[PDB]
Amino acid sequence: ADKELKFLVVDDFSTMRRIVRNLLKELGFNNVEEAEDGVDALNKLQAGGFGFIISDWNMPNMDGLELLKTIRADSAMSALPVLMVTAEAKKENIIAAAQAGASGYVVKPFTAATLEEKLNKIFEKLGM
Amino acid sequence: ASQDQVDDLLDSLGF
Numbered sequence: 001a002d003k004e005l006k007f008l009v010v011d012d013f014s015t016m017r018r019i020v021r022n023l024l025k026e027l028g029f030n031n032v033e034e035a036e037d038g039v040d041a042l043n044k045l046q047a048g049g050f051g052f053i054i055s056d057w058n059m060p061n062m063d064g065l066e067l068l069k070t071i072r073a074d075s076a077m078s079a080l081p082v083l084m085v086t087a088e089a090k091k092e093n094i095i096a097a098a099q100a101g102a103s104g105y106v107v108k109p110f111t112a113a114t115l116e117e118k119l120n121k122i123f124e125k126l127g128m
Numbered sequence: 129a130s131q132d133q134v135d136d137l138l139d140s141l142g143f
C-alpha cells in the first residue's frame with residue numbers, strides 16, 4: 001500500500017495540526033507537511049508532490065472554504081482530495097463545503113477511528 | 129450536526 005502519499009495539514013491551531021500529523025503517522029503516512037491558513041497552504045502546495053489535503057475551516061488570512069474553492073479552480077490541482085476537519089457544524093455550511101467540492105467532512109471533536117474511516121472512504125471513491 | 133448527522137447529510141448529497 002502506498003504510504004508515500006504526501007499530506008498537507010492545514011489548521012491555525014498548533015495542537016490540532018499535531019493531532020492530525022500524529023494520527024496520519026499511526027496510519028503509516030510520514031510524508032506530512034503543515035500550514036496555518038489558506039495563504040500558507042497555497043505557498044506550500046507550489047513546492048509540488050502533495051496528494052492529499054486535510055483542512056480546517058476557520059483560519060485567518062484565508063479560510064478553508066476559500067482555500068478549497070481556490071484548489072478546485074486551479075488546473076494545477078483541481079481534483080486534489082480535500083478532507084474538511086472543522087468545528088463548523090451548521091447544516092448550511094456543511095452543504096456549502098460539499099457543493100464547493102469537499103471530498104469529505106469531519107466535525108470536531110473527532111476520534112482517531114473517525115479520521116481513519118473518512119480517509120479510507122475518500123481513497124475508495126478515487127480508486128486509491 | 130453530530131458526525132452521524134454529517135454522514136447522513138453527505139450520503140444524501142451522493143458521497
Ligand code: BEF
Pocket residue numbers: 056057058059085086087088108
Ligand atoms: F477552526 Be476550524 F474550523 F475548527
Ligand SMILES: [Mg+2]
Pocket residue numbers: 011012013056057058059
Ligand atoms: Mg481554526
